Amino acid sequence: FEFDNLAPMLATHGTVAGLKASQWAFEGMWDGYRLLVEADHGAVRLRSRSGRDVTAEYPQLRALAEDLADHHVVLDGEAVVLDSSGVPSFSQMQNRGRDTRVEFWAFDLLYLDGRALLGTRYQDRRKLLETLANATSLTVPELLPGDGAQAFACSRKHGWEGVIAKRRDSRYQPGRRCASWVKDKHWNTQEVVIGGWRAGGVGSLLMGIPGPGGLQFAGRVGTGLSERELANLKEMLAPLHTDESPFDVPLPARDAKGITYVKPALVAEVRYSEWTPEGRLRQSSWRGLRPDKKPSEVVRE
Numbered sequence: 001f002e003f004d005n006l007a008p009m010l011a012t013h014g015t016v017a018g019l020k021a022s023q024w025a026f027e028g029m030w031d032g033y034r035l036l037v038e039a040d041h042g043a044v045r046l047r048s049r050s051g052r053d054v055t056a057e058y059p060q061l062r063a064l065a066e067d068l069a070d071h072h073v074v075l076d077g078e079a080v081v082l083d084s085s086g087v088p089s090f091s092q093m094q095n096r097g098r099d100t101r102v103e104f105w106a107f108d109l110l111y112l113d114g115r116a117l118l119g120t121r122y123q124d125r126r127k128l129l130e131t132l133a134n135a136t137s138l139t140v141p142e143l144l145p146g147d148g149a150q151a152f153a154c155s156r157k158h159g160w161e162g163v164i165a166k167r168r169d170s171r172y173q174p175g176r177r178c179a180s181w182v183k184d185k186h187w188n189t190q191e192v193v194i195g196g197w198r199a200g201g202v203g204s205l206l207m208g209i210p211g212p213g214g215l216q217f218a219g220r221v222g223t224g225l226s227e228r229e230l231a232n233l234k235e236m237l238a239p240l241h242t243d244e245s246p247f248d249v250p251l252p253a254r255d256a257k258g259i260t261y262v263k264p265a266l267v268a269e270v271r272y273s274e275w276t277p278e279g280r281l282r283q284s285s286w287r288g289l290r291p292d293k294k295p296s297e298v299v300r301e
Ligand SMILES: Nc1ncnc2c1ncn2[C@@H]1O[C@H](COP(=O)(O)OP(=O)(O)OP(=O)(O)O)[C@@H](O)[C@H]1O
Pocket: 009, 010, 011, 027, 028, 029, 030, 031, 032, 034, 078, 107, 164, 183
């Protein structure tokens, strides 16, 4: 076992309603950044999903192990920023500033005080993690009770993004996406390319799907407004400003009012209920930017 070779295990997109509690545990899906956390001698070290050393990017998490000073542990979990409803928000994480509070929500334990746990079944790793957290300041969200449909319904009532089901008998497989973990969201989600923006900072974004002849306008998506989402989103949009509309049809007057067009370089993810027959996203909401996705990969899902 070696923390410096570790990469997170990944979940397969699927449906959790139908899965039974006898074989499956159910966790809330937390929007944030995935972190592997090594705590030793009261000091913390961090690895991102890409294996990069990101310890310096999270000074908020330095105190994580000050309560664990006698332990040597490796944890898996999510760094999160909570919205005003208490729910992890990806956009608030992406737009965090120097005063923004960041938490680490742990959901796995991969090494504990001389015992490497990759081959230990999830159900047993969880009990060890819960015991560790009950005695310290580590934050370990509880499992959702019931079978998959009940767990999904509970997640929805809380306003959480979805559920991750994890097989109770499953080992931890670093760096692999596995059938033993199933991820399921309440909302349909669609990748879109940003073609322009309107002020309230940045009040809203004009979305499109790449096609022959340019972006096919998919509607305006409100940002929700952090008044820092906007200063930061403006920052990412500023190098892309252009006088040339990227859309395949010049935008209608109401959608073009006050618009700054951008080169169609940035992918974002939005939630939606259904497509309209004209190609617009109904009940859209902003999840956040997807900086590693390429516009050429964006297709109507
Ligand atoms: N409780 C949890 N246990 C494990 N992973 C979680 C949990 N909560 C959130 N995640 C992570 O959040 C993401 C939720 O799935 P989603 O489809 O939004 O991911 P993504 O970033 O689009 O794709 P990927 O699965 O490649 O990360 C996954 O990365 C998942 O591993």
